[PDB]
Amino acid sequence: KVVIIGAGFAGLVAARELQTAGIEYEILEAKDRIGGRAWTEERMGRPLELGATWVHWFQAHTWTEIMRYGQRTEITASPSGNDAHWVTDGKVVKGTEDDLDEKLTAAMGVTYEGSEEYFPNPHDPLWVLSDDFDGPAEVRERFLSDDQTNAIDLVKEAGFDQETIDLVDAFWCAGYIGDPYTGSALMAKQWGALSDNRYRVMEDITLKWKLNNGMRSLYDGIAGDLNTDIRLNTPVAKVEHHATVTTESGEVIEASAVICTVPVGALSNIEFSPALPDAVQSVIDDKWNSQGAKIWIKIKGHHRFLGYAPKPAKMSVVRSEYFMDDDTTILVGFGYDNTNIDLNSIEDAQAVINQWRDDLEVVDTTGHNWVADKWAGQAWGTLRKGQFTQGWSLFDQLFFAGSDYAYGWRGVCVDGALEKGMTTARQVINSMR
Ligand SMILES: Cc1cc2nc3c(=O)[nH]c(=O)nc-3n(C[C@H](O)[C@H](O)[C@H](O)COP(=O)(O)OP(=O)(O)OC[C@H]3O[C@@H](n4cnc5c(N)ncnc54)[C@H](O)[C@@H]3O)c2cc1C
Ligand SMILES: NCCc1ccc(O)c(O)c1
């Protein structure tokens, strides 16, 4: 009676929540698998996360699922103390990881600089624009101005030198999963607000703890709780919200309400009748700022490596992640432009490593191009200029659920999908009561 489109974390958790409340549901999943943009799979000799990877106990929704499905102790920190390399003026600079972090810490201090006035409650991101806002006019003006400013311009304008600029440029190529110069700096400021405004905490939350048993231990857990079979290989083609849903084969399914978790980068596969609001339609057409890609590279030997490179490098942040039995290292990498790298080309993977070193030898590589993926069309959702205040909040019988619309760790984190999936089901629940 309630139709959930997509079996990623938002869809699975919404179904479990409806089930709790005794409401009939059905999940229609385009792919032949569950997990969506979280995808644990054996590649290159071990389970690797092709999408979502890191977790933290300060992420409320993720951490309760970690507790629920038995992974409390089953988390491991990514290697630290790497030999660090960063490109800053056509040149490769060699340092320690702590050397890099302290440069990034001071720049982050400036980047967060008004989060305390914007986000007293870091989970009320649009409070400044609320009728309830009790602050001065000049804070609302700085807020809107920040939505139209990118995060690197904030560091440039504070007088930092070119070294620190290319470091933040590389950082946000990875963080904004695409071109950071088109991004909204209010995203970065809210990550600060959710991280006690400390670079170190922000990295502990987003870039440290991995699930020993992968994301699949969680989404297999949620799916294992459901008493209604997920209909895989059932891509949705049309949605009528007056609700009626039409699959690609032409099957028609009737429903009291529709919870659509299809990411924006993939909504163009579905026709809506009536059409979507013009405001929301312009977001879909502009979509999100996530055009980048994530790679897994394997090299010869055991090397503790960290590398940073600004736009337009193939990869902006690359880091050792696993030391393997056969004297190899698996590194992870994040880059701003999915179309500048073939994630499964040993030669393109070598050119990534060649950004910093001419003595490290790639022997394998792999990745999934989420942006080119029909059912995704993006990496993790990040914000263009103007999308903090006129973007993710515009998607509020038809409900949109997904990390990209979350109040808290929006887009970038499974925490956001688990948040928004659950609260969107509550909207359904509340209105049926
Ligand atoms: C490279 C990468 C790395 C990430 N790393 C992390 C990390 O370390 N930590 C973290 O917390 N988060 C991370 N994330 C983010 C996390 O994966 C997402 O925020 C979360 O999985 C989004 O869940 P969702 O349910 O909102 O969307 P999705 O996972 O995209 O779920 C949508 C589902 O709908 C399906 N679908 C699409 N179109 C249709 C259609 N027409 N009909 C039917 N079904 C359809 C899709 O197949 C998919 O199963 C990462 C994301 C990426 C891309
Ligand atoms: N994949 C985790 C998302 C992410 C990307 C870049 C960062 O700089 C960061 O702190 C977190």
Side-chain angles (χ1 to χ4, degrees), residues 1-432:
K1 179 203 291 193
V2 165
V3 163
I4 298 161
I5 315 179
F9 270 119
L12 299 153
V13 86
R16 198 195 58 207
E17 189 85 11
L18 296 170
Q19 178 171 303
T20 301
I23 297 174
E24 177 61 288
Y25 63 88
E26 187 168 27
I27 294 183
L28 320 178
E29 172 51 40
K31 293 181 172 180
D32 80 308
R33 54 163 292 259
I34 63 173
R37 281 166 291 156
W39 184 16
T40 305
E41 213 145 86
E42 185 81 19
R43 306 242 188 121
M44 298 197 303
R46 61 144 301 105
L48 297 176
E49 300 289 19
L50 297 150
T53 299
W54 294 287
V55 300
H56 196 282
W57 48 93
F58 288 170
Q59 295 176 330
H61 303 274
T62 298
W63 188 258
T64 75
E65 306 301 342
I66 284 173
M67 295 296 304
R68 167 176 281 109
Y69 299 112
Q71 308 305 309
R72 177 178 60 86
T73 63
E74 294 297 332
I75 53 163
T76 301
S78 301
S80 43
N82 297 292
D83 291 353
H85 309 61
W86 53 97
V87 175
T88 168
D89 223 304
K91 317 261 191 233
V92 164
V93 180
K94 256 279 281 181
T96 77
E97 180 158 355
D98 267 317
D99 289 336
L100 203 154
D101 286 5
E102 277 304 336
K103 298 176 187 289
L104 281 185
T105 300
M108 279 316 156
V110 168
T111 311
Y112 303 154
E113 256 182 13
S115 64
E116 322 230 342
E117 286 99 46
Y118 299 160
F119 311 120
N121 182 337
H123 295 267
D124 189 24
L126 300 184
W127 175 70
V128 162
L129 300 185
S130 80
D131 269 6
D132 273 356
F133 178 60
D134 61 27
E138 285 85 354
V139 168
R140 180 168 284 166
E141 315 182 330
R142 240 132 40 208
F143 191 68
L144 302 161
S145 150
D146 279 339
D147 207 5
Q148 301 301 340
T149 316
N150 71 58
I152 293 126
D153 279 348
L154 299 185
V155 164
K156 273 165 153 174
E157 268 152 43
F160 283 98
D161 69 10
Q162 180 59 220
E163 196 190 37
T164 278
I165 286 172
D166 296 309
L167 275 176
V168 291
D169 174 332
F171 186 90
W172 288 124
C173 280
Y176 275 86
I177 201 60
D179 183 358
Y181 292 94
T182 51
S184 166
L186 286 182
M187 199 188 71
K189 287 192 201 289
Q190 203 204 342
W191 291 15
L194 297 170
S195 304
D196 198 40
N197 286 306
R198 294 183 181 277
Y199 169 68
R200 184 61 256 151
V201 176
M202 197 183 70
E203 293 302 279
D204 285 4
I205 295 185
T206 51
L207 250 59
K208 191 182 192 174
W209 293 95
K210 309 176 285 190
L211 290 160
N212 294 352
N213 300 304
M215 286 293 158
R216 71 176 162 189
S217 75
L218 302 187
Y219 61 67
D220 282 349
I222 297 161
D225 281 352
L226 303 179
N227 60 40
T228 305
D229 302 343
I230 297 157
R231 287 193 55 188
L232 311 173
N233 312 296
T234 299
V236 178
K238 172 179 197 175
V239 169
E240 315 179 90
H241 46 111
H242 301 328
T244 288
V245 170
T246 306
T247 85
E248 272 192 3
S249 84
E251 186 173 353
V252 153
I253 320 185
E254 209 101 353
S256 63
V258 174
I259 292 149
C260 171
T261 73
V262 174
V264 155
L267 285 168
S268 268
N269 302 318
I270 300 197
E271 104 176 272
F272 297 94
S273 265
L276 281 192
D278 267 3
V280 161
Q281 187 65 52
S282 52
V283 161
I284 289 147
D285 300 349
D286 287 350
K287 309 183 233 302
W288 307 120
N289 207 94
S290 60
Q291 280 68 51
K294 160 172 187 178
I295 196 170
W296 295 97
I297 306 183
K298 168 132 88 190
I299 57 172
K300 270 174 152 235
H302 285 181
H303 310 276
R304 312 183 170 274
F305 181 80
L306 181 63
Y308 268 52
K311 170 180 169 193
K314 287 175 188 73
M315 290 281 148
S316 283
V317 167
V318 160
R319 169 172 91 181
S320 312
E321 286 295 344
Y322 300 103
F323 311 104
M324 308 295 289
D325 283 347
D326 62 338
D327 202 28
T328 60
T329 307
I330 294 172
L331 304 103
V332 79
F334 300 91
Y336 93 104
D337 180 5
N338 77 102
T339 66
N340 190 23
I341 181 160
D342 184 338
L343 305 168
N344 292 277
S345 162
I346 289 162
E347 285 184 44
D348 266 5
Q350 185 67 51
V352 165
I353 298 312
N354 287 3
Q355 298 166 359
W356 300 285
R357 304 268 308 226
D358 67 12
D359 57 319
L360 295 166
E361 169 187 348
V362 174
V363 301
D364 203 356
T365 189
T366 190
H368 183 60
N369 189 355
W370 294 104
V371 178
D373 186 325
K374 175 145 69 196
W375 313 110
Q378 61 188 60
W380 65 79
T382 57
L383 294 175
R384 307 187 180 272
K385 281 169 179 166
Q387 300 188 312
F388 200 101
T389 67
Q390 301 272 4
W392 66 266
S393 63
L394 305 176
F395 293 78
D396 240 23
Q397 332 292 348
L398 170 57
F399 302 79
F400 286 109
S403 187
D404 302 338
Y405 326 113
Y407 283 113
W409 278 105
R410 166 190 330 108
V412 58
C413 293
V414 169
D415 190 65
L418 295 170
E419 174 208 310
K420 190 62 179 184
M422 184 271 296
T423 63
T424 293
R426 293 317 282 212
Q427 301 178 253
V428 175
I429 287 160
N430 286 348
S431 98
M432 292 195 193

